[PDB]
Design a protein around this motif. Sequence first.
Motif, PDB file in Angstrom:
ATOM      1  N   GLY A   1      -5.600   2.031   8.335  1.00 37.61           N
ATOM      2  CA  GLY A   1      -4.906   3.188   8.886  1.00 37.61           C
ATOM      3  C   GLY A   1      -3.433   3.252   8.540  1.00 37.61           C
ATOM      4  O   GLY A   1      -2.823   2.221   8.234  1.00 37.61           O
ATOM      5  N   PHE A   2      -2.870   4.455   8.566  1.00 37.19           N
ATOM      6  CA  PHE A   2      -1.419   4.670   8.562  1.00 37.19           C
ATOM      7  C   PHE A   2      -0.956   4.868   9.992  1.00 37.19           C
ATOM      8  O   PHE A   2      -1.623   5.545  10.764  1.00 37.19           O
ATOM      9  N   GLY A   3       0.201   4.334  10.353  1.00 39.91           N
ATOM     10  CA  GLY A   3       0.717   4.500  11.687  1.00 39.91           C
ATOM     11  C   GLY A   3       2.201   4.827  11.712  1.00 39.91           C
ATOM     12  O   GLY A   3       2.902   4.634  10.743  1.00 39.91           O
TER      13      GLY A   3
ATOM     14  N   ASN B   1      11.341   1.435  -1.003  1.00 36.33           N
ATOM     15  CA  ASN B   1      10.214   0.548  -0.806  1.00 36.33           C
ATOM     16  C   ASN B   1       9.526   0.694   0.572  1.00 36.33           C
ATOM     17  O   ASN B   1      10.149   1.112   1.571  1.00 36.33           O
ATOM     18  N   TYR B   2       8.243   0.364   0.636  1.00 33.30           N
ATOM     19  CA  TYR B   2       7.479   0.474   1.880  1.00 33.30           C
ATOM     20  C   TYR B   2       7.791  -0.658   2.852  1.00 33.30           C
ATOM     21  O   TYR B   2       7.986  -0.405   4.042  1.00 33.30           O
ATOM     22  N   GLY B   3       7.859  -1.894   2.342  1.00 37.79           N
ATOM     23  CA  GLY B   3       8.170  -3.074   3.146  1.00 37.79           C
ATOM     24  C   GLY B   3       7.320  -4.269   2.776  1.00 37.79           C
ATOM     25  O   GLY B   3       6.092  -4.255   2.861  1.00 37.79           O
TER      26      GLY B   3
ATOM     27  N   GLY C   1      -3.737  -2.439 -12.273  1.00 40.90           N
ATOM     28  CA  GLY C   1      -2.758  -2.934 -11.343  1.00 40.90           C
ATOM     29  C   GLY C   1      -2.606  -2.007 -10.171  1.00 40.90           C
ATOM     30  O   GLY C   1      -3.383  -1.078  -9.956  1.00 40.90           O
ATOM     31  N   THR C   2      -1.584  -2.283  -9.382  1.00 42.02           N
ATOM     32  CA  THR C   2      -1.300  -1.491  -8.184  1.00 42.02           C
ATOM     33  C   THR C   2       0.209  -1.443  -7.962  1.00 42.02           C
ATOM     34  O   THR C   2       0.994  -1.829  -8.835  1.00 42.02           O
ATOM     35  N   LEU C   3       0.601  -0.929  -6.809  1.00 42.03           N
ATOM     36  CA  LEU C   3       2.001  -0.971  -6.391  1.00 42.03           C
ATOM     37  C   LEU C   3       2.396  -2.405  -6.067  1.00 42.03           C
ATOM     38  O   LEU C   3       1.780  -3.044  -5.204  1.00 42.03           O
ATOM     39  N   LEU C   4       3.408  -2.926  -6.765  1.00 43.97           N
ATOM     40  CA  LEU C   4       3.851  -4.298  -6.530  1.00 43.97           C
ATOM     41  C   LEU C   4       4.340  -4.505  -5.092  1.00 43.97           C
ATOM     42  O   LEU C   4       5.178  -3.739  -4.576  1.00 43.97           O
ATOM     43  N   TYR C   5       3.780  -5.539  -4.458  1.00 43.91           N
ATOM     44  CA  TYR C   5       4.250  -6.088  -3.170  1.00 43.91           C
ATOM     45  C   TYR C   5       3.960  -5.247  -1.935  1.00 43.91           C
ATOM     46  O   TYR C   5       4.305  -5.679  -0.839  1.00 43.91           O
ATOM     47  N   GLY C   6       3.250  -4.122  -2.069  1.00 41.95           N
ATOM     48  CA  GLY C   6       2.889  -3.318  -0.894  1.00 41.95           C
ATOM     49  C   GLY C   6       1.617  -3.807  -0.218  1.00 41.95           C
ATOM     50  O   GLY C   6       1.163  -4.923  -0.447  1.00 41.95           O
ATOM     51  N   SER C   7       1.039  -2.978   0.648  1.00 36.43           N
ATOM     52  CA  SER C   7      -0.151  -3.447   1.381  1.00 36.43           C
ATOM     53  C   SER C   7      -1.352  -3.723   0.497  1.00 36.43           C
ATOM     54  O   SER C   7      -2.109  -4.632   0.786  1.00 36.43           O
ATOM     55  N   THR C   8      -1.541  -2.980  -0.605  1.00 34.24           N
ATOM     56  CA  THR C   8      -2.670  -3.231  -1.489  1.00 34.24           C
ATOM     57  C   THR C   8      -2.481  -4.590  -2.146  1.00 34.24           C
ATOM     58  O   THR C   8      -3.398  -5.395  -2.183  1.00 34.24           O
ATOM     59  N   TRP C   9      -1.263  -4.860  -2.599  1.00 28.97           N
ATOM     60  CA  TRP C   9      -0.932  -6.141  -3.235  1.00 28.97           C
ATOM     61  C   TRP C   9      -1.277  -7.278  -2.272  1.00 28.97           C
ATOM     62  O   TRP C   9      -1.924  -8.272  -2.619  1.00 28.97           O
TER      63      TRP C   9
ATOM     64  N   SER D   1       5.856   7.843   7.741  1.00 30.16           N
ATOM     65  CA  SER D   1       5.562   7.714   6.327  1.00 30.16           C
ATOM     66  C   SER D   1       4.097   7.358   6.183  1.00 30.16           C
ATOM     67  O   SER D   1       3.395   7.150   7.185  1.00 30.16           O
ATOM     68  N   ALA D   2       3.651   7.226   4.950  1.00 31.62           N
ATOM     69  CA  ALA D   2       2.297   6.743   4.696  1.00 31.62           C
ATOM     70  C   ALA D   2       2.349   5.218   4.680  1.00 31.62           C
ATOM     71  O   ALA D   2       2.140   4.568   3.649  1.00 31.62           O
ATOM     72  N   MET D   3       2.709   4.656   5.830  1.00 31.34           N
ATOM     73  CA  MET D   3       2.881   3.197   5.959  1.00 31.34           C
ATOM     74  C   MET D   3       1.625   2.582   6.535  1.00 31.34           C
ATOM     75  O   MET D   3       1.198   2.883   7.638  1.00 31.34           O
TER      76      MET D   3
ATOM     77  N   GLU E   1       0.319  -8.467   9.066  1.00 34.04           N
ATOM     78  CA  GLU E   1       1.597  -9.114   8.815  1.00 34.04           C
ATOM     79  C   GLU E   1       2.728  -8.256   9.324  1.00 34.04           C
ATOM     80  O   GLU E   1       3.662  -8.750   9.890  1.00 34.04           O
ATOM     81  N   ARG E   2       2.627  -6.943   9.119  1.00 31.22           N
ATOM     82  CA  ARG E   2       3.674  -6.041   9.610  1.00 31.22           C
ATOM     83  C   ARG E   2       3.659  -5.946  11.129  1.00 31.22           C
ATOM     84  O   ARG E   2       4.742  -5.834  11.741  1.00 31.22           O
ATOM     85  N   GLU E   3       2.473  -5.979  11.745  1.00 34.66           N
ATOM     86  CA  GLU E   3       2.416  -5.959  13.208  1.00 34.66           C
ATOM     87  C   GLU E   3       3.147  -7.107  13.877  1.00 34.66           C
ATOM     88  O   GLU E   3       3.520  -7.003  15.047  1.00 34.66           O
TER      89      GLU E   3
ATOM     90  N   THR F   1       6.342   2.303  -8.402  1.00 36.71           N
ATOM     91  CA  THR F   1       6.014   3.545  -7.729  1.00 36.71           C
ATOM     92  C   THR F   1       4.612   3.979  -8.113  1.00 36.71           C
ATOM     93  O   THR F   1       4.147   3.709  -9.222  1.00 36.71           O
ATOM     94  N   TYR F   2       3.909   4.620  -7.190  1.00 37.24           N
ATOM     95  CA  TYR F   2       2.617   5.171  -7.523  1.00 37.24           C
ATOM     96  C   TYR F   2       2.767   6.162  -8.664  1.00 37.24           C
ATOM     97  O   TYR F   2       1.930   6.176  -9.542  1.00 37.24           O
ATOM     98  N   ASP F   3       3.838   6.966  -8.662  1.00 36.05           N
ATOM     99  CA  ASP F   3       3.938   7.992  -9.749  1.00 36.05           C
ATOM    100  C   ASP F   3       3.965   7.323 -11.135  1.00 36.05           C
ATOM    101  O   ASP F   3       3.356   7.863 -12.062  1.00 36.05           O
TER     102      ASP F   3
HETATM  103  N1  LIG Z   1       0.825   2.512   1.935  1.00 37.24           N
HETATM  104  C1  LIG Z   1       1.209   1.247   1.252  1.00 37.24           C
HETATM  105  C2  LIG Z   1       1.881   1.486  -0.102  1.00 37.24           C
HETATM  106  C3  LIG Z   1       0.827   1.764  -1.204  1.00 37.24           C
HETATM  107  C4  LIG Z   1      -0.010   0.551  -1.571  1.00 37.24           C
HETATM  108  O1  LIG Z   1       0.347  -0.595  -1.224  1.00 37.24           O
HETATM  109  O2  LIG Z   1      -1.052   0.773  -2.274  1.00 37.24           O
HETATM  110  C5  LIG Z   1       2.117   0.435   2.165  1.00 37.24           C
HETATM  111  O3  LIG Z   1       2.386   0.876   3.303  1.00 37.24           O
HETATM  112  O4  LIG Z   1       2.547  -0.650   1.753  1.00 37.24           O
END
Ligand SMILES: N[C@@H](CCC(=O)O)C(=O)O
Length: 266
Positions: A224-226, A65-67, A142-150, A94-96, A101-103, A178-180
């Motif tokens: 952005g990703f960081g 999971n991303y977080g 839909g999207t990835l559950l609970y990630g940044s898009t969510w 990673s592509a995080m 909220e994460r900051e 998962t995106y896949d």
């Molecule tokens: N890059 C996203 C995961 C993909 C998404 O949420 O669409 C993240 O760091 O949570």
Amino acid sequence: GSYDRNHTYIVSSLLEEPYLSLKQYTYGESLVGNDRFEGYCKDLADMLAAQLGIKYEIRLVQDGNYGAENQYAPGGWDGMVGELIRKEADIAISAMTITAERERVIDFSKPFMTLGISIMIKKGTPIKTPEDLTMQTDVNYGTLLYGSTWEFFRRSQIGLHNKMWEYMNANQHHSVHTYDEGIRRVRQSKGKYALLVESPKNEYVNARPPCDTMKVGRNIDTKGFGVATPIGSPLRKRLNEAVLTLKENGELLRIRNKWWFDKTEC
Ligand SMILES: N[C@@H](CCC(=O)O)C(=O)O
């Protein structure tokens, strides 16, 4: 020069093509260590480590999971973010997505890549905009559950985004872990599924076989990703400086082109 360079720094990451993937397995050759991995984030990790004069070891995140904030997770976050909070990893590369909220619980470098939320459809699907999704019935999304898009949709003050939030939250079975899996659903649902997916992932998939998907609409946001570190990390300043160095000297552009433009292919 005032940090430990004997320590092998532990880098949390997550398999997600083209950011990080397993090198193709071959007959009679067993890959081990960081040699198992390739992709944009592998190349980035190599360059950052060389800038800082450190050794590193990729250890994939133990829950895939991303977080996200999780009332069950120790420290309040799962995924890579949680691994950093609890000091189980030294860096996440990673592509995080950098979020407000994460900051509040981990630190990010300046971004190494820009992106936005976007829409992926199977070619032929009669959807051109986010607005369109909310004005029709046959195409679920839909999207990835609970990630940044969510979380973007949950927190947005824009009526349209709140409408999309209310739908997805009431129909979580149309969102994915998962995106896949989401991409498989786009491809296998005969024009009846759309995926909300960050633009670099979207662009990569659309430019490669089987050439049956496309991006529609403008990006919904700009993001952005960081490179992420636990608060207090002695590496925080030097990692940010290293990202800026790689940005200015064209190296980030070179590896973005390596993994996106050099892999088209459609
Ligand atoms: N890059 C996203 C995961 C993909 C998404 O949420 O669409 C993240 O760091 O949570």
